[PDB]
Write a protein that holds these residues in place. Structure first.
Motif, mmCIF file in Angstrom:
data_model
loop_
_atom_site.group_PDB
_atom_site.id
_atom_site.type_symbol
_atom_site.label_atom_id
_atom_site.label_comp_id
_atom_site.label_asym_id
_atom_site.label_seq_id
_atom_site.Cartn_x
_atom_site.Cartn_y
_atom_site.Cartn_z
ATOM 1 N N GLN A 41 13.828 -49.985 -57.544
ATOM 2 C CA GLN A 41 14.031 -48.730 -58.255
ATOM 3 C C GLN A 41 14.866 -47.744 -57.448
ATOM 4 O O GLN A 41 15.589 -46.929 -58.026
ATOM 5 C CB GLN A 41 12.709 -48.085 -58.599
ATOM 6 N N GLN A 59 13.130 -51.556 -65.964
ATOM 7 C CA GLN A 59 14.185 -51.695 -64.967
ATOM 8 C C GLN A 59 15.384 -52.464 -65.511
ATOM 9 O O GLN A 59 16.528 -52.158 -65.173
ATOM 10 C CB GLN A 59 13.617 -52.401 -63.740
ATOM 11 N N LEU A 109 17.272 -49.855 -67.322
ATOM 12 C CA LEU A 109 18.091 -49.063 -66.397
ATOM 13 C C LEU A 109 19.341 -49.820 -65.980
ATOM 14 O O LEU A 109 20.436 -49.250 -65.935
ATOM 15 C CB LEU A 109 17.302 -48.686 -65.146
ATOM 16 N N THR A 162 23.283 -48.710 -66.154
ATOM 17 C CA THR A 162 24.257 -48.571 -65.085
ATOM 18 C C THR A 162 25.466 -49.464 -65.330
ATOM 19 O O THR A 162 26.606 -49.037 -65.105
ATOM 20 C CB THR A 162 23.618 -48.881 -63.735
ATOM 21 N N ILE A 171 18.613 -42.601 -69.203
ATOM 22 C CA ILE A 171 18.312 -42.847 -67.802
ATOM 23 C C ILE A 171 17.077 -42.068 -67.390
ATOM 24 O O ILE A 171 16.182 -42.602 -66.733
ATOM 25 C CB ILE A 171 19.524 -42.493 -66.931
ATOM 26 N N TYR A 212 13.835 -43.719 -69.005
ATOM 27 C CA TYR A 212 13.376 -44.959 -68.409
ATOM 28 C C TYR A 212 12.946 -44.747 -66.961
ATOM 29 O O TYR A 212 11.993 -45.392 -66.504
ATOM 30 C CB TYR A 212 14.459 -46.024 -68.527
ATOM 31 N N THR A 213 13.593 -43.820 -66.237
ATOM 32 C CA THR A 213 13.158 -43.531 -64.867
ATOM 33 C C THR A 213 11.747 -42.970 -64.838
ATOM 34 O O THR A 213 10.949 -43.358 -63.978
ATOM 35 C CB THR A 213 14.079 -42.545 -64.142
#
Lengths: 35, 36, 23, 36, 23, 23
Positions: B18, D17, D20, D24, E11, E14-15
């Motif tokens: 992470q 994750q 994420l 990105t 972002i 989800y973070t």
């Protein structure tokens, strides 16, 4: 069973570490062609 | 070796991943900032 | 708040860290 | 509580994750398509 | 597609989602 | 050096790999 689910989880994080390696690489390219 | 030790291990590699994800969202935001 | 050098150093540190936990 | 539950949680973490990561990758693609 | 605001939005969600699951 | 096509193909590969380990 948990030995099997855990081996799978390990292989996932491995592959994900490769994806990370790749996004870092692309960032590096971009940045070296703006900075 | 034992399932719990290995479970910890998998937790630590996930929190580390992470922080890598975090670091990449940062660089993106940075080049996003240069460009546009 | 970061430099690109320090970013690279942090990427390298966490990559070795995961890479230890995975070997 | 226990390893079934810490394992379900670990699965949901890697799921999120993966999202994420998809993001990105997406941003990288935008940037790169506006420099290359 | 997407906007950059909505990307940032996603972002951030989800973070915190991971960040909760990790405590 | 990678090409951006081959990067995309590797991202796609690892995404379906994870995505099938997650079923």
């Amino acid at each position: 069973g948990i030995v099997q689910q855990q081996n799978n989880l390990l292989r996932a994080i491995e592959a994900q570490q490769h994806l990370l390696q790749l996004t870092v690489w692309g960032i590096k390219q971009l940045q070296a062609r703006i900075l | 070796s034992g399932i719990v030790q290995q479970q910890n291990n998998l937790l630590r590699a996930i929190e580390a991943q992470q922080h890598l994800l975090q670091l990449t969202v940062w660089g993106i935001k940075q080049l996003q900032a240069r460009i546009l | 708040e970061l430099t690109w050098e320090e970013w690279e150093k942090k990427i390298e540190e966490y990559t070795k860290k995961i890479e230890e936990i995975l070997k």
